[PDB]
Amino acid sequence: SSCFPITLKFVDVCYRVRTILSGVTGMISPGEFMAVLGPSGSGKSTLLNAVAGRLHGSNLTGKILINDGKITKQTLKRTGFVAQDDLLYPHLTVRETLVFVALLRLPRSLTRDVKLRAAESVISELGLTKCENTVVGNTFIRGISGGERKRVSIAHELLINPSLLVLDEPTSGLDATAALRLVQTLAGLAHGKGKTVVTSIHQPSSRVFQMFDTVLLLSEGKCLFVGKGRDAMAYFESVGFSPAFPMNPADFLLDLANGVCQRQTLVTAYDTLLAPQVKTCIGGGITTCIATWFSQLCILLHRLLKERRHESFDLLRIFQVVAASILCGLMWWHSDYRDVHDRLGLLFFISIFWGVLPSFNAVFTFPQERAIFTRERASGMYTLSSYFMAHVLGSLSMELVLPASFLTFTYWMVYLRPGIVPFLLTLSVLLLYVLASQGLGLALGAAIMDAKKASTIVTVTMLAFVLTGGYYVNKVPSGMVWMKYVSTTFYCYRLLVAIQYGSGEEILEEEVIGDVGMWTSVGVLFLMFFGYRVLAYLALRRIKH
Amino acid sequence: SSCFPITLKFVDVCYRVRTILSGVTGMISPGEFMAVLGPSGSGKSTLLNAVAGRLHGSNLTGKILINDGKITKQTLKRTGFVAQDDLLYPHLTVRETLVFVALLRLPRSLTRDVKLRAAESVISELGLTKCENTVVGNTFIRGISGGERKRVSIAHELLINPSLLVLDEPTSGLDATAALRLVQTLAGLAHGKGKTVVTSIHQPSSRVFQMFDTVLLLSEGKCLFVGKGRDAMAYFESVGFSPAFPMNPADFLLDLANGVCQRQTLVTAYDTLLAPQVKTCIGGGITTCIATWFSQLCILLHRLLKERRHESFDLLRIFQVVAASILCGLMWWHSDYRDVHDRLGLLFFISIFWGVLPSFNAVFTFPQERAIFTRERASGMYTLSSYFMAHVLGSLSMELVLPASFLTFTYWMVYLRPGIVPFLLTLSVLLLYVLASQGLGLALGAAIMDAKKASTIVTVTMLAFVLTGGYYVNKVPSGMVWMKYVSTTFYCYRLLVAIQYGSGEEILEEEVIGDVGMWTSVGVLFLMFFGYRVLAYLALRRIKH
Ligand SMILES: CC1=CC(=O)CC(C)(C)[C@@]1(O)/C=C/C(C)=C\C(=O)O
Helix, strand or coil: CCCCCCCEEECCCCEECCEEECCCCEEECCCCCEEEECCCCCCHHHHCCCCCCCCCCCCECCCCEECCCCCCCHHHCCCEEECCCCCCCCCCEHHHHHHHHHHHHCCCCCCCCCCCCCCCHHHHHCCCCCCCCCECCECCECCCCHHHHHHHHHHCCCCCCCCCEEECCCCCCCCCCHHHHHHHHHHHHHHHCCCCCEECCCCCCCCCHHHCCEEEEECCCCEEEEECCCCHHHHHHHHCCCCCCCCCHHHHHHHCCCCCCCCHHHHHHHHHHCHHHHHHHCCCCCCHHHHHHHHHHHHHHHHCCCHHHHCCCCHHHHHHHHHHHHHHHHHCCCCCCCCHHHHHHHHHHHHHHHHHHHHHCCCCCCHHHHHHHHHHHCCCCCCHHHHHHHHHHHHHHHCCHHHHHHHHHHHCCCCCCCCHHHHHHHHHHHHHHHHHHHHHHHHHHHHHCCHHHHHCCHHHHHHHHHHCCCCCCCCCCCCCHHHHHHCHHHHHHHHHHHHHCCCCCCCCCCCCCCCCCCHHHHHHHHHHHHHHHHHHHHHHCCCCC | CCCCCCCEEECCCCEECCEEECCCCEEECCCCCEEEECCCCCCHHHHCCCCCCCCCCCCECCCCEECCCCCCCHHHCCCEEECCCCCCCCCCEHHHHHHHHHHHHCCCCCCCCCCCCCCCHHHHHCCCCCCCCCECCECCECCCCHHHHHHHHHHCCCCCCCCCEEECCCCCCCCCCHHHHHHHHHHHHHHHCCCCCEECCCCCCCCCHHHCCEEEEECCCCEEEEECCCCHHHHHHHHCCCCCCCCCHHHHHHHCCCCCCCCHHHHHHHHHHCHHHHHHHCCCCCCHHHHHHHHHHHHHHHHCCCHHHHCCCCHHHHHHHHHHHHHHHHHCCCCCCCCHHHHHHHHHHHHHHHHHHHHHCCCCCCHHHHHHHHHHHCCCCCCHHHHHHHHHHHHHHHCCHHHHHHHHHHHCCCCCCCCHHHHHHHHHHHHHHHHHHHHHHHHHHHHHCCHHHHHCCHHHHHHHHHHCCCCCCCCCCCCCHHHHHHCHHHHHHHHHHHHHCCCCCCCCCCCCCCCCCCHHHHHHHHHHHHHHHHHHHHHHCCCCC
């Protein structure tokens, strides 16, 4: 219950890029709820973002100090920044969202019994105890309300028990009566638990402004007032400013910020009477560290299990595989093998279809989760190498179910080779070709990080793999014959003809007998399996935070 | 300057679907600016939407009367409803947005000289005279600000010179100083031009509330107050309600609406003293009507000219045609004609490529403009049959430029038949096949009106057109031989072989000699040109308003 108070002080100076801040000074006591209010463009989104400790070094000079000391990464585990946008996964319920977060945030030396009841204490500490089985959703999946998405985001940050909670415009997008009941619980933290809540309200209401203990005006840099907030109106009356009509106190002193009198004399009056009074108050880790890698993998596989299933077994993607499998069983119904030219066109349609679908659907995976990943990683929850291996191991499970259902339905209708040993070789070649074609699309989406531009580069790439696959053109013109050795469609189609026909000898046009080999064609699809996953990792470690 | 005043009166009763409204009475004088404010769910979005005249008949009973009469379509040309969302075209500048609207809204009997200076009077009557050459844009195209998108929407409605302007939450999404300067011009209309502006502000500010002449509270049905707005605070003081702390007057009396005292005694006190005092105040057209059809077509072709060009000459669609034309000229470089099997696979790749691209890109045209069309049509600007023929005639101009550039580059590299009469027959067959494949996608998107679901039904349809086109399967199994006669890819590929080879006789495998005919293959692609445009119209007149 916060038996470690943080007395935040800051006497900093400008933050340039023009100056955003210029001269801000102030101090925050434990047990106070403070609002930082000002016009749009006054740098209130930077004073919060530089007193949590997220801006430093180059163009930020000052003497920000926590607890009469220095802002250190030791005194940054007791600090929580609730940002302005919410980044949650949709298909998880509210209770299992905060249990997956509680197993990753809280340290390893505890047990899994004082760790998942610290996640259902925060359920009842905020108001999230009625909606704990509703899914979260988004604006395509019906779930919790917009005032309870913000309460999950604050509950995401209270699991580590901070002593300083910085929030960046919480009540933005909330209606009139949920923005009031969210200020009631943030004022209850600082008055009941002894924390040091600091927030920046955009345009406060009339009875929201009564819930504050301290305000701080910012007008394009320097500050005009810092004080109790019940005596802000009486202060400017002594300077000679009073409203002409009954009005909100937070509309009055925010009009005085952007020059509208009812801003040159206001700054000079501040550094004569009020600013020189707040200045007066101024041998292991080898075998365990590999075992902590795999528990981060076992939790990241269970979180993303319903996310790797929504995109895989989509209902408009089941319809495309069921439609393509009735058309193959009807155009090649009860086929004969003694007419080679139709049997080779069946086997080449399977190479086109299962190279285009896994590659095109794989370019959307990494661009859509870049914002969630770079926030979740820069708080010490996981690294790149365990998030990457949860997408690798979780996507080669789900994507083998629709090609195995295509080939059970179609193999025995179209009369391919009878036997259990030719059926299992045709299935094995096709499931390796689907995994080698997926990795082409994973590498292209990670190198580009735009879903529209990556979609037209995997489309152009597969066009050159189909045309060099060996079915349309018989005599490649002598400077383009090298190009077929880099395509995945070439090695699959030359394998499938080797199961069904072998090398002549029963059917003897020598488009059956090839020029590659069989172990050379399965040794290269393994090189393209691993090789396109290594290049997807290196394109992702290039986005240096 | 509004020399026709409208004195709006309404003594209506409930509007059910539960009751939304219950007992509302009131009257509006000319020259008054009135706000309709209340909590979210109190039916203030229906009292406006039923006093403009957009709700009537079944479950709406009352005695709404304009100018001591009856609400008639004669007295509805002097009425303007500014809705809550803005539906504009992005690539147009602000000046030519309001000139294209001025040629369609203002009547035909004027000239085109007192019609396009009535569109640059409204430019300066509002504040749209500095940004009149900036494009409008959206949130993908950088253009005008969000407070000036709302001023174009009010300028869209002032061209007909109304005398009663009803606005539905104008200042929603605007910041603090643009919401004030938009109320300054709406208060200037009613105080300077004599109009009868009626609006519904969501959460007014402190000095926005000083700009009102009349308010009307609504609490879930019945009304609590209607009066001057400068004496709303003194009225509830006589009922026994006063604030305990200095506050916005529009936050106080909106908390009294949803029950929070500082709502059962408030309604009963209204129908004793205040409600029985507002009740006391209570032979041509044949040759001209075809000439007015084509001027609506000549303006709708010029509006949409930059919209049919942004989607056609997209930069990621030029790259796909330039890439596919280097790969054809390189895999078939300097080809020989005496080897028939490679020449037939070239001609079938052109049939696949130019059937898949026009059909897939055409399903997005009509779903993305359904909201703009059904608003713009139910105000008497155009009909369905002139909006349809501007999309038909405007899309068969732009989509013939990339297939003509594909075939100029590639025909002479791959060594097809030399001559000017075989070159112009190959170009003519391909440009008819692109127009017949576009109309398949126009008909599917108009029948479904969802872009995701229509994209997987044109993809399944073209898969059955490719497999029955006549290249992969040689011997179709006796109950599927009918199916090739409905595919567009069949008739194109059998035409292209007839230009290049004829019927044997120089090359004599009889996959050259077909079974259809030549005039039978061009008579059916014309039947699929017109036939897929008739079905797209009938699917669009099915959405009955
Ligand atoms: C691989 C590819 C990408 C494109 O550029 C478009 C295109 C339609 C040509 C294609 O889908 C090619 C499809 C082919 C050759 C055959 C088919 O589907 O039967």
